[PDB]
């Protein structure tokens, strides 16, 4: 219960997900798979259904097969008593939906050798902060999170689970330029669904009615994700991920972080992100 995290080649792990490595070394991608990447709380479950009802043909009663980490495997994933993502992967049928937050200096080289296809979601890293400051509190296999403030200050020189925020969006950003990547943004998706889906559709070479596109944006919406088992967490354990801290489905804005940081703490922080940030052509918004 909230066992430290453990570094592996730079880059700071959940305890379990380390150990889940070994076995990762023998996962094999084929040239179908579609790669679902991105940065912890960045829109990984949002675009995880809405690619997984595109591939279901919009079909909702499909998609309730089973819970969203049974159908979209999460790689890296490992935990006591629970089913490791390569467990789960052995029983997907292709063409296969796969999960993973790895850096690139852990992402199994199968993946990039196959070409296989890249959706990566980026989501302003004040945001980021404070959803992953309560899914630290939820998610028990994180270790302590303590106080905002200690948090904060983890977040800024990337001491959390899976390193800096600010090396991610930038080395996948940079791999899009040699590499079959659709690199969206949580706010781009936020501001008009029915664009950021219609991207994704001619992205992965499907095609699909209007009439079907306006029934995706309603049941991928928030509100409906939220109600919905089969992709809000509430049937894993308790002792794994306790909704009564924080529910999985916390609030789903874009501008949220505004509440929690303090002025201090956003010129701190401002000044920080200015540095790290400074060679990089990324722009993101921070609200709306
Ligand atoms: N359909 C939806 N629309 C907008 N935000 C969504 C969403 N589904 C989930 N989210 C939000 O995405 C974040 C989790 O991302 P991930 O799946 O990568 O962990 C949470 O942010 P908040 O904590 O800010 O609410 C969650 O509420
Ligand atoms: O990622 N998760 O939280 C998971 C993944 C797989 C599982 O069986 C249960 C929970
Ligand atoms: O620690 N956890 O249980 C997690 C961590 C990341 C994620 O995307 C899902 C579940």
Same mark, same amino acid.
């Given at each position: =219960?909230?066992?430290?995290?453990?570094? #592996?080649?730079?880059?700071?792990?959940?305890?379990?997900?380390?150990?889940?490595?070994?076995?990762?070394?023998?996962?094999?991608?084929?040239?179908?798979?579609?790669?679902?990447?991105?940065?912890?709380?960045?829109?990984?479950?949002?675009?995880?259904?809405?690619?997984?009802?595109?591939?279901?043909?919009?079909?909702?009663?499909? +998609?309730?097969?089973?819970?969203?980490?049974?159908?979209?495997?999460?790689?890296?994933?490992?935990?006591?008593?629970?089913? =490791?993502?390569?467990?789960?992967?052995? %029983?997907?049928?292709?063409?296969?939906?796969?999960?993973?937050?790895?850096?690139?200096?852990?992402?199994?080289?199968?993946?990039? @050798?196959?070409? #296989?296809?890249?959706?990566? $979601?980026?989501? /302003?890293?004040? %945001? $980021?902060?404070?959803?992953?400051?309560?899914?630290?509190?939820?998610?028990?296999?994180?270790?302590?999170?303590?106080?905002? @403030?200690?948090?904060?200050?983890?977040?800024?020189?990337?001491?959390?689970?899976?390193? =800096?925020?600010?090396?991610?969006?930038?080395?996948?950003?940079?791999?899009?330029?040699?590499?079959?990547?659709?690199?969206?943004?949580?706010? @781009? &998706?936020?501001? /008009?669904?029915?664009?950021?889906?219609?991207?994704?559709?001619?992205?992965?070479?499907?095609?699909?009615?209007?009439?079907?596109?306006?029934?995706?944006?309603?049941?991928?919406?928030?509100?409906?994700?939220?109600?919905?088992?089969?992709? /809000?967490?509430?049937? $894993?354990?308790?002792?794994?991920?306790?909704?009564?801290? =924080?529910?999985? &489905?916390?609030?789903?804005?874009?501008? @949220?972080?505004?509440?929690?940081?303090?002025?201090?703490? /956003?010129?701190?922080? %401002?000044?920080?992100?200015?540095?790290?940030?400074?060679? +990089?052509?990324?722009?993101?918004?921070?609200?709306?």
């Amino acid at each position: =219960s909230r066992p430290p995290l453990e570094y #592996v080649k730079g880059v700071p792990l959940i305890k379990y997900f380390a150990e889940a490595l070994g076995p990762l070394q023998s996962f094999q991608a084929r040239p179908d798979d579609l790669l679902i990447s991105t940065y912890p709380k960045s829109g990984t479950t949002w675009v995880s259904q809405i690619l997984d009802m595109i591939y279901q043909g919009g079909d909702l009663e499909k +998609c309730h097969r089973a819970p969203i980490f049974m159908r979209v495997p999460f790689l890296e994933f490992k935990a006591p008593g629970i089913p =490791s993502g390569m467990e789960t992967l052995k %029983d997907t049928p292709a063409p296969r939906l796969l999960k993973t937050h790895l850096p690139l200096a852990l992402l199994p080289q199968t993946l990039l @050798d196959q070409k #296989v296809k890249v959706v990566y $979601v980026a989501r /302003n890293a004040k %945001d $980021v902060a404070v959803s992953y400051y309560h899914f630290y509190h939820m998610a028990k296999v994180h270790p302590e999170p303590g106080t905002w @403030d200690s948090f904060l200050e983890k977040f800024m020189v990337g001491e959390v689970s899976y390193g =800096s925020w600010y090396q991610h969006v930038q080395e996948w950003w940079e791999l899009s330029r040699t590499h079959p990547v659709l690199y969206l943004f949580y706010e @781009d &998706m936020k501001e /008009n669904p029915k664009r950021e889906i219609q991207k994704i559709l001619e992205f992965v070479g499907h095609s699909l009615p209007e009439e079907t596109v306006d029934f995706m944006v309603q049941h991928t919406s928030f509100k409906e994700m939220k109600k919905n088992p089969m992709t /809000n967490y509430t049937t $894993v354990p308790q002792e794994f991920m306790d909704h009564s801290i =924080s529910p999985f &489905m916390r609030k789903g804005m874009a501008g @949220d972080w505004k509440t929690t940081f303090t002025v201090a703490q /956003n010129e701190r922080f %401002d000044a920080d992100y200015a540095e790290k940030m400074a060679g +990089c052509s990324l722009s993101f918004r921070s609200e709306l």
